[PDB]
């Protein structure tokens, strides 16, 4: 409710889950998905925790999570929208 | 108490913490260290969750955690010893 993902973000999460399941296992995949669900709730309950990245796109914020990086836009005081969950294909560009 | 790290494992954790702090921030580093503390407690409360890797060394088990991989040996029914927290420099070798 305080956070919602896009179809692309859900597809990315499914890709990562299937990858970690085919490599490690099913319980591993469950632990990994519980971790990002916790990260989702954390970004919702605290949207100023992700470093701002207006340079890349105006309004977006990014948060590191293992080998991937969640991109999300703040849509409320404690509401955020997760748009993409990519890998390390990202750039700082300060 | 149910888990304990070595000097090398603590040095690795300190390296990762300082890296994520210099790159992202202090609160990021705290969230990251809370995640691995949770992973430590999980590996202690459930030591059969890490895929066995006797091929590499007899008795060790490995668990994925973002861009690093915890290596730990089971020293009890619900007690484990974390020896190393390396990056992706690892090999399956099935």
């Amino acid at each position: 409710k305080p956070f919602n993902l896009t179809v692309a973000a859900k597809a990315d999460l499914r890709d990562i889950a299937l990858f970690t399941q085919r490599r490690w296992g099913k319980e591993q995949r469950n632990v990994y998905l519980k971790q990002f669900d916790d990260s989702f709730w954390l970004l919702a309950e605290n949207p100023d925790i992700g470093k701002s990245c207006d340079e890349i796109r105006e309004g977006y914020r990014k948060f590191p999570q293992g080998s991937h990086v969640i991109f999300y836009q703040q849509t409320g005081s404690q509401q955020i929208r997760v748009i993409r969950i990519l890998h390390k294909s990202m750039d700082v560009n300060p | 108490k149910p888990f304990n790290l070595t000097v090398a494992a603590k040095a690795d954790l300190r390296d990762i913490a300082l890296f994520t702090q210099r790159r992202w921030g202090k609160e990021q580093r705290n969230v990251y260290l809370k995640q691995f503390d949770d992973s430590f407690w999980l590996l202690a409360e459930n030591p059969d969750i890490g895929k066995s890797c006797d091929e590499i060394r007899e008795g060790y088990r490995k668990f994925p955690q973002g861009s690093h991989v915890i290596f730990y040996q089971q020293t009890g029914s619900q007690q484990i010893r974390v020896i190393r927290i390396l990056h992706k420099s690892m090999d399956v070798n099935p």
């Binding site: 998905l33 669900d37 796109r57 991109f71 929208r81 993409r84 | -």
Partner: protein, 73 residues
């Protein structure tokens, strides 16, 4: 021509002396290749964000997602 400074001029000379780069044009071209690759990477990340944001909001719940993934295999 252009003016970079004592830092980069010194750098370019040390890179040429190392035998890894023949000409100063060569090392400047390698740097420009790096910058162009990073620009293409930036634009690719931007188009990924665009195609992600102009897609629909998806109905997400952790346990429902796990149940779906279990029903797949």
């Amino acid at each position: 021509s252009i003016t970079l400074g004592e830092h980069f001029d010194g750098f370019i000379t040390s890179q040429i002396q190392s035998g890894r780069y023949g000409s100063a044009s060569e090392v400047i071209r390698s740097a420009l290749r790096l910058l162009e690759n990073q620009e293409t990477k930036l634009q690719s990340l931007r188009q990924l964000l665009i195609e992600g944001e102009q897609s629909g909001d998806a109905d997400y719940d952790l346990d429902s997602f796990i149940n779906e993934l279990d029903s797949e295999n």
